[PDB]
């Protein structure tokens, strides 16, 4: 039923459970990361992020966010190591962000909300494609990276500058040769836990890997995110803001830390 849901009073996160009852499941995302109770796990490995051959193809306003899509038909941009068994291939990235700098992230850190959160979505190659992977408990690995407002992120500007061409729902643009290495912080220290997609269909198929170090973006860069629209061309303007799901109950889960 993946239309009719969105980020408002009458169709936002508190209503999703009527169409998608797994919304109240046992391993929903995002969560608050309580840094004091996350366990350092010396068995966790460094994360291996291998994006040197990533081939972006296109950027799309899907009406909830915008997606930068990658050709995932070959063995190219891969996440492995960390808490993962096997290899996961990059399919898309997107962001969640606020109406104001004080909110926007989906995960929180000791209840702190960041201005935005980047999700690099990868599927486990043992399942052959994304659509089969999402039906499995180890099907996806999502690398989450917080954004704070400060210095500009130069590697983000090619994204920001294309947004006026995909202002409205359903618009796409060639978006080739974008290098997602330019969106990564210096450290790959992370927290990890088992969870879910944060939008409908809310499937419980994700190993979450959330980096501790945020990236900085400028006020001007996030302001351009907030000029996007959730409506389609020729409809009344609803700014694309506050496209985040709040933290969900941790229930029977442990968050592990790769560090300290
Ligand atoms: N925010 S997040 O990183 O957790 C996230 C990642 C991916 C998606 C989709 O692919 C949603 N979606 C879009 N089409 C789909 C077909 C099958 C299953 C899911 C599908 C939704 C949320
Ligand atoms: Zn997301």
Swiss-Prot record:
Q: What is the effect of changing residue 62 to V?
A: Reduced activity
- Give a yes or no for keyword Membrane in this entry: yes
| Cofactor(s) it depends on | Zn(2+); Co(2+)
Under what name is this protein listed?
Carbonic anhydrase 2
Q: What is the effect of changing residue 62 to D?
A: Strongly reduced activity
The record's section on Pfam families has:
Carb_anhydrase (PF00194)
**Reactions mediated catalytically:** hydrogencarbonate + H(+) = CO2 + H2O; urea = cyanamide + H2O
Q: What organism is listed for this UniProt entry?
A: Homo sapiens (Human)
* Effect caused by changing residue 94 to C/D/E/N/Q: Strongly reduced CO(2) hydrase and p-nitrophenyl acetate esterase activities, impaired stability of zinc binding
Which Gene Ontology molecular function entries are recorded, alphabetically? arylesterase activity; carbonate dehydratase activity; cyanamide hydratase activity; zinc ion binding
According to the UniProt record, list the residues that bear N-acetylserine.
2
Alpha-carbonic anhydrase domain segment(s): 3-259
The entry's Zn(2+)-binding residues are 94, 96, 119
Q: What is the effect of changing residue 64 to W?
A: Impaired activity, rescued by 4-methylimidazole (4-MI). Impaired activity, not rescued by 4-methylimidazole (4-MI)
Question: InterPro entries under this entry?
Answer: CA_dom, CA_dom_sf, Carbonic_anhydrase_a-class, Carbonic_anhydrase_a-class_CS
Q: Which SMART domains match?
A: Carb_anhydrase (SM01057)
**Record note on cofactor:** Zinc. Can also use cobalt(II) with lower efficiency, but not copper(II), nickel(II) and manganese(II).
Q: CDD domains of this UniProt entry?
A: alpha_CA_I_II_III_XIII (cd03119)
């Amino acid at each position: 039923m993946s239309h009719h849901w969105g980020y408002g009073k009458h169709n936002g996160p508190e209503h999703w459970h009527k169409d998608f009852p797994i919304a109240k499941g046992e391993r929903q995302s995002p969560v608050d990361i309580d840094t004091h109770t996350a366990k350092y796990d010396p068995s966790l490995k460094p994360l291996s992020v291998s994006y040197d051959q990533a081939t972006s193809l296109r950027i799309l306003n899907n009406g909830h966010a915008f997606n930068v899509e990658f050709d995932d038909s070959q063995d190219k941009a891969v996440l492995k190591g960390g808490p993962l068994d096997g290899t996961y291939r990059l399919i898309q990235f997107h962001f969640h962000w606020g109406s104001l700098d004080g909110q926007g992230s989906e995960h929180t850190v000791d209840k702190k909300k960041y201005a935005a959160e980047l999700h690099l979505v990868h599927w486990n190659t043992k399942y052959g494609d994304f659509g089969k992977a999402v039906q499995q408990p180890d099907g996806l690995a999502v690398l989450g990276i917080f954004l704070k407002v400060g210095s500009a992120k130069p590697g983000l500007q090619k994204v920001v500058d294309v947004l006026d061409s995909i202002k409205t729902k359903g618009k796409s643009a060639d978006f080739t040769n974008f290098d997602p290495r330019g969106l990564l912080p210096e450290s790959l220290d992370y927290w990890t836990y088992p969870g879910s997609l944060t939008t409908p269909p809310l499937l419980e198929c994700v190993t979450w890997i959330v980096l501790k170090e945020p990236i900085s973006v400028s006020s001007e860069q996030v302001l351009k995110f907030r000029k996007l629209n959730f409506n389609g061309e020729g409809e009344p303007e609803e700014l694309m803001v506050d496209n985040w799901r709040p933290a969900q109950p941790l229930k029977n889960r442990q968050i592990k830390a790769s560090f300290k």
